[PDB]
Design a protein around this nucleic acid. Structure first.
Length: 1280
RNA sequence: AAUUUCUACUGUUGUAGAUGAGAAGUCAU
DNA sequence: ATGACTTCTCTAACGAGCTCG
DNA sequence: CGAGCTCGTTAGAGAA
């Protein structure tokens, strides 16, 4: 079991906390403006990062414009490509990587050797050196102040006349960008890492250009057609100036042909963005800004040719568009603003004030006066067709308001005579309902609606039934909806002036819902005034035969004015989720306090550069931000003075990067003479002889690794550390150098043990003294458990943080504090209101609660997370720091489970909406142990039930459209359930020696994200400290998360299984709905019954049978005889989705429906032998198309829906001794409810994975996939 | 409805469970 | 226009530009 | 101006 499976690999968390200002640190900071002047160095940090980045683009458009020509090796890459992708052999794949390597270094050589490359990625870009300012103003102040590249119109920054101020503000702050330029240096990286522009061109466009000239050589096999070199390129000449040709050379401004493309050696023209925007007009085709028509390209002419010629497979020869170059800008050539929310409403009032109709009038003044003529059929009163989806119901709800009133009479005129049942396929047909009938996607007109209502008027009671003229008064005041939306514009004069702030947010909080009455109801006149006039517009819905017989009289203003007044259905999608956004309206911006390199590390020697140390005061943790002006105020001088009592002080001591550090002191100019490196050793470090991949010192030669030419370099290191002034404090204990093997085994142990944390007591009166002027900023690290009113269980981001500083920890550090983190200042989101006030009754909101009120002495403000300008401190850690890893992990536990066999259980899952899951803890030998749901959860005493809260909000899909004003915020709701599930999954695994499985989904998937990310480190809040699950020694069960798409057939102990074919199955044998009868033609249903062994009524037992060996079938020939029956009282389906039709499960019995047939056809059964031949002897539409819904029911087992009335699973087979399985007559070790037998055999799928691992051998590839001829094979031989 | 955040909260100035942040860029049921 | 996929960092110290002098 | 002088480079391993 999992008794040694702790401390396996290392991680990285990010514990967050909150900083409470102590003393009057809040009075020091708010005095001058030390955070007032912040958000001008966390806002201008990103304003400058995207004015530094277009010059980081303008560079790439002049180091890929006319340069970087990797000629004729493209041919050398074309050779290794087509043969390897067609024949995956070993020898070319080596040559493939050789071709892959060589293009990059050829390209990257000129890339890394520019005029502007070197002085871009350090101090020499922004501000470098006295006398000038370096390369960043060399483009703006020099190149683009004289010349004009005005992208300040196309930006957030106003102009360039002011933009100098954003540039010069970082003077000296140019060590602060040192993570931002730590990913630009993977843009130019010629390594196998996919952010690069060199992985963009070599391996991500070049095998997408070899598959381009594997088709253009096959294009001009019959492609002479009307392609723009034949007809027109006057437009595409300024657009295709084509400055260079790179097979030999070119004239400056010559226009090329359709042959420069697809050359193997012209791939050195397809590098940058401006050059793929000229590759994707030729295949793209673009516009002219002058009221013109689209001027096409190549794949917009094959659109005009594979419809001319009838070659349907000629669309295999379209040219795939290339990708985008990394980091390239794009050219042109919902919201949050409380002004645009008041301006788009003003634009909806203004857009109706100038809408152009046909007669120089409005769209409402055109469709309204025509209704007076169209009501008398003055327009085309016979072919007024709309998109036939809901206008049959909406017109039935237009003036009559009926679901079965007017729109249910067109069935006797539309789609009932594709094949009449009189001598033309009356019973013998191939089910010609798609071939002989195509009346599904036809449109219905007003004359066809009037003619549909003629049979309903002929079926009407009164003789004054509905004609096409009398019911025409229903669309009279539809043009009057513009008069009512005009009533929502007088109050906007007190609304638009009441929206004079840029970032207003007058409704996004929790208090201003009544202010939206001027917008959630004045936008209602366009909510329903256009929502009722949708019958006068022709939609786009057809089953391949859409004609509809459209008219032209009223349809001219219908598509125009219905489109001219579409400022509501677009405008009401503009207040669509602006209202339902909960307050986390944060900014979370960085604090500096003058220190760019703030808090990067805690180690003592660098402390006036970081200017932050922590303070323990007997488990009340504080943060001290030393002010930069006086940052020496915690040296050893004051520690020798103020050795008193009060705040303990953190002494941190650190050796980071033993690759980068043990050659940083020991071979460097200021201090090499103190160390005195020997003769043979100084040979090694130059040429990197001690490494296997290490970079040698420049101007030398990478020699070979050697055995003693590395171990001596440890023998240098084992003595040279003890000579250091500070690093002899640690007292390392290395092993013998016979036992080392490389330098990783040494650089790990100088980074394992290179961490010690100690404590120096400080007199409390001194700290109180220094805070009062401003010479220290002290802040308390704070969450739930760092307030005084806790009782019980602390957060798992407060069992770690309280165990960094443990004296059981710092024996052998498994929680290494880390650095680099920042301080964040969220402003006030929620303005303070209580709304659950003091000492009064407030109602509960649970249902299984033995209480119904609450008293609440103290107030509860709506959001005290967000009424307070809380500070925010981050804090990385490193769980299992001394024991890193994360390799060979998925193959470890298989060797673990083998030795500890016969002792392991299985978890499970299913999904649904009728449940949310249903776990099932299964044994290893059949008879299962436990089984429950994930609806009863939180089972200590409170028992909340998430299962019903989803359907509680699914019923309320209206008010975001109706009064345009709903608050549910369901999008984090449902994911928020998924968190609570994890622990109850997590508890069972250790407690019952279990393994876990899941479903696949290659948001029901996101719960598998959250057990790979959360069996990284599994520590129980109730478990004892430094015991097998405690905060130091806890469970690492997953190797961590990379992607969904390589989640494996294992991701730890979380084995997987294939989806589907669980939710239908009898348990004790395992037969599935594998037939699929649907009665296409007549005697193919006789082909069903003719293959049986015998079909008899078991008169000795009181039910029918259908005995069949499955051999005589061919869709999926799962063998074995099958003996289904009629004894269960199986339920028919509801035939659901019907508001007035048969949507109820009228239960049809099996045994009392074949004696309906025995009465209809008197084929007896008293002899007790084969009765197959006579039942085959009948052929009728009545005999078989009614036998469908019976034979859809003798088998079907999931049932009983619309009510969840213990929907239940009924066995046909009666395996060994004649008893069935009804899943409510079912014992506890068998499935029990709706989605229960789905999650059972998944475990029996899971036991099959264990069946291979149990008899596993030394085969390093282990077969963890399940064949359908195994899952249907294993479970049918369990008892035997 | 109170939280480092987020979900449900009465589990009472909080309770139970999980909680990785910052900058980037790429891609698409 | 949200989800998904690969990669970065999670540092103290030295050697230099540094105004002092 | 040689002590020192205060932020920007700089050492650059090992799985697979």
């Amino acid at each position: 079991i999992y008794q040694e499976f702790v401390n396996k690999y290392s991680l990285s968390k990010t514990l967050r906390f909150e900083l409470i200002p102590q003393g009057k640190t809040l009075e020091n900071i708010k005095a001058r403006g030390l955070i007032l002047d912040d958000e001008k160095r966390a806002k201008d940090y990103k304003k400058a990062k995207q004015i530094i980045d277009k010059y980081h683009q303008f560079f790439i458009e002049e180091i890929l414009s006319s340069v970087c020509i990797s000629e004729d090796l493209l041919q050398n890459y074309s050779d290794v490509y087509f043969k390897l992708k067609k024949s995956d052999d070993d020898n070319l794949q080596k040559d493939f990587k050789s071709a892959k390597d060589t293009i990059k270094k050829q390209i990257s050589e000129y890339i890394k050797d520019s005029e502007k490359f070197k002085n871009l990625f350090n101090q020499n870009l922004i501000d470098a050196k006295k006398g000038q300012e370096s390369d960043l103003i060399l483009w703006l102040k020099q190149s683009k102040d004289n010349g004009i590249e005005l992208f300040k119109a196309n930006s957030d920054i106003t102009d360039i006349d002011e933009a100098l101020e954003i540039i010069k503000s970082f003077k000296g702050w140019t060590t602060y960008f040192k993570g931002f330029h730590e990913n630009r240096k993977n843009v130019y990286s010629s390594n196998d890492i996919p952010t690069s522009i060199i992985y963009r061109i070599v391996d991500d466009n070049l095998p997408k250009f070899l598959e381009n000239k594997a088709k253009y050589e096959s294009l001009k096999d019959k492609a002479p057609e009307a392609i723009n070199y034949e007809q027109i390129k006057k437009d595409l000449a300024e657009e295709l100036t084509f400055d260079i040709d790179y097979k030999t050379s070119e004239v400056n401004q010559r226009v090329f042909s359709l042959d420069e493309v697809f050359e193997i050696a012209n791939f050195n023209n397809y590098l940058n963005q401006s050059g793929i925007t000229k590759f994707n007009t030729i295949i793209g085709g673009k516009f002219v800004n002058g009221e013109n028509t689209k001027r096409k390209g190549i794949n917009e002419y094959i659109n005009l040719y594979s419809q001319q010629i009838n070659d349907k497979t000629l669309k295999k020869y379209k040219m795939s568009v290339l990708f985008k170059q990394i980091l390239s800008d794009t050219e042109s050539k919902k919201l949050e603003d409380d002004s645009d929310v008041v301006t788009t409403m003003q634009s909806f009032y203004e857009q109706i004030a100038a809408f152009k109709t046909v007669e120089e009038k409005s769209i409402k003044e055109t469709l309204s006066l025509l209704f007076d003529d169209l009501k008398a059929q003055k327009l085309d009163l016979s072919k007024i067709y709309f998109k036939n989806d809901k206008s049959l119901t909406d017109l039935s709800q237009q003036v009559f308001d009926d679901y079965s009133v007017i729109g249910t009479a067109v069935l006797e005129y539309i789609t009932q005579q594709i094949a009449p049942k009189n001598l033309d396929n009356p019973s013998k047909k191939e089910q010609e309902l798609i071939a002989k009938k195509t009346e599904k996607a036809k449109y219905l007109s007003l004359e066809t609606i009037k003619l549909a209502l003629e049979e309903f008027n002929k079926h009407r009671d009164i003789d004054k039934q509905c004609r096409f003229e009398e019911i025409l008064a229903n669309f009279a005041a539809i043009p009057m909806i513009f008069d009512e939306i005009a009533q929502n514009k007088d109050n906007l004069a007190q609304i638009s002036i009441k929206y004079q702030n840029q970032g207003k947010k007058d409704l996004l909080q929790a208090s201003a819902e009544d202010d939206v009455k001027a917008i959630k109801d004045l936008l209602d006149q366009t909510n329903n005034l256009l929502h009722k006039l949708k019958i006068f517009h022709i939609s786009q819905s057809e089953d391949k035969a859409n004609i509809l017989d459209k008219d032209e009289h009223f349809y001219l203003v219908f598509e125009e004015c219905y489109f001219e007044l579409a400022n509501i259905v677009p405008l009401y999608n503009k207040i669509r989720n602006y209202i339902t956004q909960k307050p986390y309206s944060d900014e979370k911006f960085k604090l500096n306090f003058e220190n760019s390199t703030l808090a990067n590390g805690w180690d003592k020697n660098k402390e006036p550069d970081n200017t932050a140390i922590l303070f323990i005061k007997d488990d009340k943790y504080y943060l001290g931000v030393m002010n930069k002006k006086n940052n020496k105020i915690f040296d050893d001088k004051a520690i020798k003075e103020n050795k008193g009592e009060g705040y303990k002080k953190i002494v941190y001591k650190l050796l980071p990067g033993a690759n980068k550090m043990l050659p940083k002191v020991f071979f460097s100019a200021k201090s090499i003479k103190f160390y005195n490196p020997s003769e043979d050793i100084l040979r090694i470090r130059n040429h990197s002889t001690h490494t296997k991949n290490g970079s040698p010192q420049k101007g030398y030669e990478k020699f070979e690794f050697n055995i003693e030419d590395c171990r001596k370099f440890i023998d240098f290191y084992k003595q040279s550390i003890s000579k250091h002034p500070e690093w002899k404090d640690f007292g390392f204990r290395f092993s013998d150098t016979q036992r080392y093997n490389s330098i990783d085994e040494f650089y790990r142990e100088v980074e394992n043990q290179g961490y010690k944390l100690t404590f120096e007591n400080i007199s409390e009166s001194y700290i109180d003294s220094v805070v009062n002027q401003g010479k220290l900023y002290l802040f308390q690290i704070y969450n739930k458990d760092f307030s005084a009113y806790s009782k019980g269980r602390p957060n798992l981001h407060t069992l770690y943080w309280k165990a960094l500083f443990d004296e059981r920890n710092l024996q052998d550090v498994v929680y290494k504090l880390n650095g680099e983190a920042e301080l964040f200042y969220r402003k006030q989101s929620i303005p303070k209101k209580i709304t659950h006030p003091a000492k009064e009754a407030i109602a509960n909101k649970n249902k299984d609660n033995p209480k119904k009120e609450s008293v609440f002495e103290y107030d509860l403000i709506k959001d005290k997370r967000f009424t307070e300008d809380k500070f925010f401190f981050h804090c990385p850690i490193t769980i299992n720091f001394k024991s890193s890893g994360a390799n060979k992990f998925n193959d470890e536990i298989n060797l673990l489970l083998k030795e500890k066999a016969n002792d392991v259980h299985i978890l499970s899952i299913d999904r649904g909406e009728r449940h949310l899951a249903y776990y099932t803890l299964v044994d290893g030998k059949g008879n299962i142990i436990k089984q429950d749901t994930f609806n009863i959860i939180g089972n200590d005493r409170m028992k909340t039930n998430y299962h019903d809260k989803l359907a509680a909000i699914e019923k309320d899909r209206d008010s975001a459209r109706k009064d345009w004003k709903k608050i549910n915020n369901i999008k984090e709701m449902k994911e928020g359930y998924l968190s609570q599930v994890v622990h109850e999954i997590a508890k069972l695994v250790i407690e019952y020696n279990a393994i876990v499985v899941f479903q696949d989904l290659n948001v029901y998937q996101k719960l598998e994200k959250m057990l790979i990310e959360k069996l990284n480190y599994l520590v129980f809040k109730d478990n004892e400290f430094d015991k097998t699950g405690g905060v130091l020694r806890a469970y690492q069960l997953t190797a961590p998360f990379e992607t969904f798409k390589k989640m494996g057939k294992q991701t730890g102990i979380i084995y997987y299984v294939p989806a589907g074919f669980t939710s239908k199955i009898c348990p004790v044998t395992g037969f599935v709905n594998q037939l699929y009868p649907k009665y296409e033609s007549v005697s193919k249903s006789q082909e069903f019954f003719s293959k049986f062994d015998k079909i008899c009524y078991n008169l000795d037992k009181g039910y029918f049978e259908f005995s069949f060996d499955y051999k005589n079938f061919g869709d999926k020939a799962a063998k074995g005889k099958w003996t289904i029956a009629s004894f269960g009282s199986r339920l028919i389906n509801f035939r659901n989705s019907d508001k007035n039709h048969n949507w109820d499960t009228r239960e049809v019995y099996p045994t009392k429906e074949l004696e309906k047939l025995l009465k209809d056809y008197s084929i007896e059964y008293g002899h007790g032998e084969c009765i197959k031949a006579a039942i085959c002897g009948e052929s009728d539409k009545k005999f078989f198309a009614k036998l469908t819904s019976v034979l859809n029911t003798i088998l079907q087992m999931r049932n009983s829906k619309t009510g969840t009335e213990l929907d239940y699973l009924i066995s046909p087979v009666a395996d060994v001794n004649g008893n069935f399985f009804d899943s409510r007559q079912a014992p506890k070790n068998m499935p029990q409810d709706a989605d229960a037998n789905g999650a059972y055999h998944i475990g029996l799928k899971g036991l099959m994975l264990l069946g291979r691992i149990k008899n596993n051998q030394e085969g390093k590839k282990l077969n963890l996939v399940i064949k359908n001829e195994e899952y249907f094979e294993f479970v049918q031989n369990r008892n035997n």
